Design a protein around this ligand. Structure first.
Ligand SMILES: *[C@@H]1C[C@H](O)[C@@H](COP(=O)(O)O)O1
Ligand SMILES: *[C@@H]1C[C@H](O)[C@@H](COP(=O)(O)O)O1
Lengths: 132, 131
């Protein structure tokens, strides 16, 4: 509790297409606090559910990369909204996808923000959000 | 008309299973009023979010087909759990996918149930759930 707790979410069983980007995000988040996340660099379901729920409640900020569709990321964002968490979502329009209306439409520009970004930009945008 | 039955399934995550969603929605109509975005373009997404949240809050039972990964379906299920809704999830293992741990691990066998099924079983299973 001596540093901010930053909870990172991104697709796993939805697909690990963006795993490298997730590691880039996590690595940068470590500059701004303790990172709580299921994601581990390449280098039971009830327990997985309960641990991520535990991390989520501990979180001061929830950071989600929402480009790859994922039930778990969506579920974690829904639980996070119900917990009144500050939320930042990061989405890549160049993927060719249209972001879920439930995520884009949940944005209010303050406590729930959805930022579009392109390859090469995410570290700069994280610096902006966390006030480097 | 009650019960109100809220159906969720992938849309912008992919419409791979849209025909199965229609089969599910058609069978749900036998047991209650069906509230769903599904019917057989961003820029106004706030209105979509608010409308599905409205339907979810009115729902007596939430039915989700969770085979195709979807942020919206997952988000709706997360909000549904926070609302302490009765939830039924339906998953097809023959899809070759491993269902999200956040959905499978949310199950408690009563208020939150996850049923595996195969093509051709979904109507019988819905009949069974809704008595
Ligand atoms: C909670 C942590 C992680 O971000 C998310 C992964 O969900 P999947 O359904 O496995 O993609 O769950
Ligand atoms: C709310 C209703 C529907 O089941 C779900 C679809 O989400 P997508 O992110 O568009 O797949 O959203």
């Amino acid at each position: 509790m001596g540093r901010p707790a930053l909870y990172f979410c991104g697709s796993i069983r939805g697909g690990r297409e963006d795993r490298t980007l997730y590691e880039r995000i996590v690595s940068r988040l470590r500059r701004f606090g303790t990172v709580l996340t299921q994601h581990v660099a390449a280098a039971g379901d009830r327990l997985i559910h309960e641990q991520d729920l535990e991390w989520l409640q501990q979180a001061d900020v929830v950071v989600a990369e929402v480009t790859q569709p994922s039930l778990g990321v969506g579920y974690e964002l829904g639980r996070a909204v119900a917990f009144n968490k500050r939320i930042l979502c990061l989405f890549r329009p160049q993927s060719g996808r249209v972001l879920s209306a439930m995520i884009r439409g949940a944005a209010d520009g303050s406590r729930f923000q959805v930022w579009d970004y392109e390859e090469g930009e995410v570290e700069a945008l994280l610096d902006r959000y966390f006030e480097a």
